[PDB]
């Protein structure tokens, strides 16, 4: 039928993943289960953790390399060796790096949580056994391993981020099932499911941004390590042209969004947490803070991400940009040509992503809902979803040509 079974792998990773995860959350010792905002969220520092330490070290790992390489490009001899040589070395560094960071988060979350959190079965006999401190450090470090080990394997079949999407699948799954989404509203919150249709509208919008603001140039060289390189004037007939430009990466909004959550978090749970109603730092400050998301994720990422260096390698290996009118001037001047496109397109991107969080915000004018749960989770769920589409896209279509049909 539609499935056109072939992929031996597809169901395999899927089923396998489900088994590992169920146990992972229920896990004894931790299993703290949760983000929403403050009350719904949770955590000692401010990390929504479905489970004790794993997604956190992931974000940590990513961020560790990200900012470090960013502000300081080359601390020690590895910007990029040749891309691969530079990359593998880089990844190995990332593995150990994130690993240790996870440990730090381990003890801290352990201490705060065990001591004073909403209903927790956790018994206390002295530091019962090896301390929830040393013992939880055990589950936290060891825990880091079972998830990490799982993630890597997941990386084999599903993905490095397949594991993440599953997290989304679960959370995102939890609410539509109607676990607890029938409550506050003006005698509503159960009618107006048009909201479901409308969210659908949201899905179509998402696909639009990621096609990439796309566009590119020309020329191909190849240098084998050695004395020489080659060149070619012309020949061949075919379609297909070069495409360089891009759109914002996977969860940028979430990265910036979290920054906002930091000041807001303090405000919801200060010592003797004052839910300042007068200054509600759940929602009220939100407009200002949300703009903060825009500046940090969009602008700063785009600068480094855009890799200021680009005109060099390009202009260097003889290139004249191609896009929206025949390109021309090389050199730095071209970075100019590109610079305009990158920040410009990013403004466009801001319009959509910001529109996401904004979207429940726009609608909630007439009858607001205390059940915000959704939105961001979608941006992520779809994100990995489209990503998996990538896996199928390449994987799919075998040799069509010697089909049975001539």
């Amino acid at each position: 039928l539609f499935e056109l079974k072939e992929l031996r792998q597809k169901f395999i990773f899927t089923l396998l993943m489900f088994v590992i995860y169920r146990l992972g959350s229920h896990i004894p010792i931790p299993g703290i289960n949760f983000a929403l905002y403050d009350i719904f969220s949770g955590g000692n520092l401010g990390r929504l953790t479905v489970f004790a330490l794993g997604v956190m070290p992931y974000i940590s790992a990513s961020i560790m390399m990200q900012l470090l390489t960013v502000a300081i490009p080359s601390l020690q001899r590895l910007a990029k060796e040749e891309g691969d040589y530079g990359r593998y070395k880089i990844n190995e560094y990332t593995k150990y790096l994130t690993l240790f960071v996870a440990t730090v988060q381990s003890l801290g979350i352990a201490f705060w949580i065990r001591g004073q959190v909403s209903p927790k079965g956790i018994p206390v006999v002295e530091n019962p056994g090896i301390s929830f401190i040393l013992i939880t450090v055990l589950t936290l470090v060891a825990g880091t391993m079972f998830l990490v080990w799982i993630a890597d394997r997941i990386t084999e079949k599903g993905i490095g981020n397949g594991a993440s999407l599953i997290i989304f699948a679960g959370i995102v799954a939890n609410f539509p099932n109607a676990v607890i989404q029938f409550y506050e509203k003006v005698k509503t919150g159960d009618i107006g499911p048009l909201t479901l249709l409308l969210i659908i509208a949201l899905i179509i919008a998402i696909i639009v941004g990621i096609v990439y603001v796309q566009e590119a140039e020309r020329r191909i060289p190849i240098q084998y390590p050695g004395r020489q390189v080659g060149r070619q004037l012309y020949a061949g007939r075919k379609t297909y042209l070069p495409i360089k430009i891009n759109p914002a990466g996977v969860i940028p909004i979430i990265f910036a969004q979290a920054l906002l959550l930091i000041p807001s978090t303090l405000l919801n749970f200060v010592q003797n947490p004052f839910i300042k109603v007068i200054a509600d730092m759940f929602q009220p400050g939100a407009i200002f803070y949300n703009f903060l998301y825009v500046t940090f994720i969009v602008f700063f990422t785009y600068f480094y991400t855009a890799v200021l260096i680009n005109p060099v390698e390009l202009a260097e290996n003889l290139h004249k940009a191609g896009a929206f009118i025949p390109g021309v001037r090389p050199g730095q001047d071209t970075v100019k040509y590109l610079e305009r496109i990158i920040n410009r397109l990013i403004f466009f991107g801001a319009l959509f992503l910001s529109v996401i969080a904004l979207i429940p915000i726009l609608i909630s004018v007439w009858f607001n809902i205390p059940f915000y749960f959704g939105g961001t989770t979608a941006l992520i769920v779809v994100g990995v979803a489209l990503d998996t589409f990538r896996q199928i896209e390449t994987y799919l279509i075998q040799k069509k040509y010697k089909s049975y049909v001539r």
């Binding site: 229920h26 699948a169 939890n174």
Partner: protein, 35 residues
Amino acid sequence: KATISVIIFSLAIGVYLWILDLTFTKIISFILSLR
């Protein structure tokens, strides 16, 4: 466009989450409940 089918797929993929989610809750609870 491709997107229309992507949405149909999106529903399909979601079906998996609902379905897989059921398994997790089922098996996971199994360990706690039985033992």
